[model samples]
Target: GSSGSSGSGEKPFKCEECGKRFTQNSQLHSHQRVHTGEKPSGPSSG
Candidate 1:
């Protein structure tokens, strides 16, 4: 029964500033600074 899948859709991290939700905590951390008027200095390749 271990097919490497949980089959559950859940968002764990939420941005308090924009109300945006993310599945991963790291992504939420990055998004939070955007609310503070911080601009991304570079482009993301992917």
Candidate 2:
């Protein structure tokens, strides 16, 4: 038997900076900065 539906509680968090959707929240957080040309580097006060 085959029972299927295209609704599996899929969470698609879209990014306002771009037309990209991340499956996880953590990813979206990092990806959001990309659009702003931000790099994940240490503080410049070093």
Candidate 3:
């Protein structure tokens, strides 16, 4: 049970490497490809 003001909303997922956040767990899992060298990396500057 989660309450408000955490400011992150229902989007409770975040990246373990570098800086990144997601609304779904699967979104993070797929985005991890950026770190695994499977998919091309996203923005370099942020």
Candidate 4:
């Protein structure tokens, strides 16, 4: 038997700047870069 998907439909990590939600903490942490003004990950898409 094979069961898939581990998302529990819960958003605990909330951005303090924005009201966005994420299933994982690392996701939320990366999202906050926009607010930090430290520049986001990598270069922007052209």
The CA root-mean-square deviation of candidate 4, after full C-alpha superposition on the true structure, stands at 7.3
TM-score of 2: 0.49
- Lowest lDDT sum, 10 consecutive residues, model 4, at 1-10
Give candidate 1 misplaced runs (Cα > 4 Å). Answer: 1-8, 39-46
**Ranking according to TM-score, highest score first:** 4, 1, 3, 2
Deviation from native of the Cα of residue 27 in model 1, angstroms? 0.2
How do the predictions measure up, each by TM-score?
A: 0.54, 0.49, 0.53, 0.56
What is the Cα-based lDDT of residue 19 in candidate 2? 64
* TM match of model 3 to true structure: 0.53
The candidate 2 region of ten consecutive residues with least summed lDDT is: 1-10
The residue-by-residue lDDT of candidate 2 on 1-46, one tens digit each, is: 3566654665578788776677998988878888787667777875
Per residue, candidate 3 scores C-alpha lDDT tens digits across 1-46 of 5774556455588888856789888999888778886755786776
Local distance difference test values of all predictions, in order: 0.83, 0.75, 0.78, 0.83
Which of 2 and 4 is ahead in TM-score? 4
lDDT of 4: 0.83
Residue 5 in candidate 3, Cα distance off native in Å: 16
lDDT, residue 24, candidate 3: 87
